[PDB]
Amino acid sequence: YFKIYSKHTPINLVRDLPQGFSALEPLVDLPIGINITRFQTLLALHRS
Amino acid sequence: LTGTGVLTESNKKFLPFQQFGRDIADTTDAVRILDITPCSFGGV
Ligand SMILES: *[C@@H]1O[C@H](CO)[C@@H](O[C@@H]2O[C@H](CO)[C@@H](O)[C@H](O)[C@H]2NC(C)=O)[C@H](O)[C@H]1NC(C)=O
């Protein structure tokens, strides 16, 4: 099972790591069952 | 999950991902929201 747990928060800093404590509710539990060793991050850029 | 007890309207608020709810002693208290309160018993 691949469990993804998610949370959203409004923060008012510029460049820091927010303080405090927040619970992380379960968003989804995909029943996939695959082997994962390496992962990437997907970014959206801008063009003009 | 089988048991014996009284079904009662629950004022507590659950979550969409939560189905069961256990209080202290790890015993069944609420089941999906309905509270489980065992019927009266005691000594004589
Ligand atoms: C997921 O795949 C990786 C391959 O990159 C597995 O890692 C190898 O596992 C074998 C055993 O089957 C070892 O002999 C190799 O030395 C491992 N290589 C590395 C780079 O770690 C990994 O075992 C797989 N995981 C699962 C759960 O199947």
Swiss-Prot record, chain A:
Glycans are attached at N35. Changing N35Q: Increased resistance to neutralizing antibodies. Changing A23V: In strain: 20A.EU1. Attaches the virion to the cell membrane by interacting with host receptor, initiating the infection. The major receptor is host ACE2. When S2/S2' has been cleaved, binding to the receptor triggers direct fusion at the cell membrane. When S2/S2' has not been cleaved, binding to the receptor results in internalization of the virus by endocytosis using host TFRC and GRM2 and leading to fusion of the virion membrane with the host endosomal membrane. Alternatively, may use NRP1/NRP2 and integrin as entry receptors. Binds to host ACE2. RBD also interacts with the N-linked glycan on 'Asn-90' of ACE2. Cleavage of S generates a polybasic C-terminal sequence on S1 that binds to host Neuropilin-1 (NRP1) and Neuropilin-2 (NRP2) receptors. Interacts with host integrin alpha-5/beta-1 (ITGA5:ITGB1) and with ACE2 in complex with integrin alpha-5/beta-1 (ITGA5:ITGB1). May interact via cytoplasmic c-terminus with M protein. May interact (via N-terminus) with host bilirubin and biliverdin, thereby preventing antibody binding to the SARS-CoV-2 spike NTD via an allosteric mechanism. This is Spike protein S1. It comes from Severe acute respiratory syndrome coronavirus 2. The chain holds residues 200 to 247 of 1273 of the full protein.
Swiss-Prot record, chain B:
Changing T2K: In strain: Omicron/BA.1. Changing A25D: In strain: Alpha/B.1.1.7. Attaches the virion to the cell membrane by interacting with host receptor, initiating the infection. The major receptor is host ACE2. When S2/S2' has been cleaved, binding to the receptor triggers direct fusion at the cell membrane. When S2/S2' has not been cleaved, binding to the receptor results in internalization of the virus by endocytosis using host TFRC and GRM2 and leading to fusion of the virion membrane with the host endosomal membrane. Alternatively, may use NRP1/NRP2 and integrin as entry receptors. Binds to host ACE2. RBD also interacts with the N-linked glycan on 'Asn-90' of ACE2. Cleavage of S generates a polybasic C-terminal sequence on S1 that binds to host Neuropilin-1 (NRP1) and Neuropilin-2 (NRP2) receptors. Interacts with host integrin alpha-5/beta-1 (ITGA5:ITGB1) and with ACE2 in complex with integrin alpha-5/beta-1 (ITGA5:ITGB1). May interact via cytoplasmic c-terminus with M protein. May interact (via N-terminus) with host bilirubin and biliverdin, thereby preventing antibody binding to the SARS-CoV-2 spike NTD via an allosteric mechanism. This is Spike protein S1. It comes from Severe acute respiratory syndrome coronavirus 2. The gene is S. The chain holds residues 546 to 595 of 1273 of the full protein.
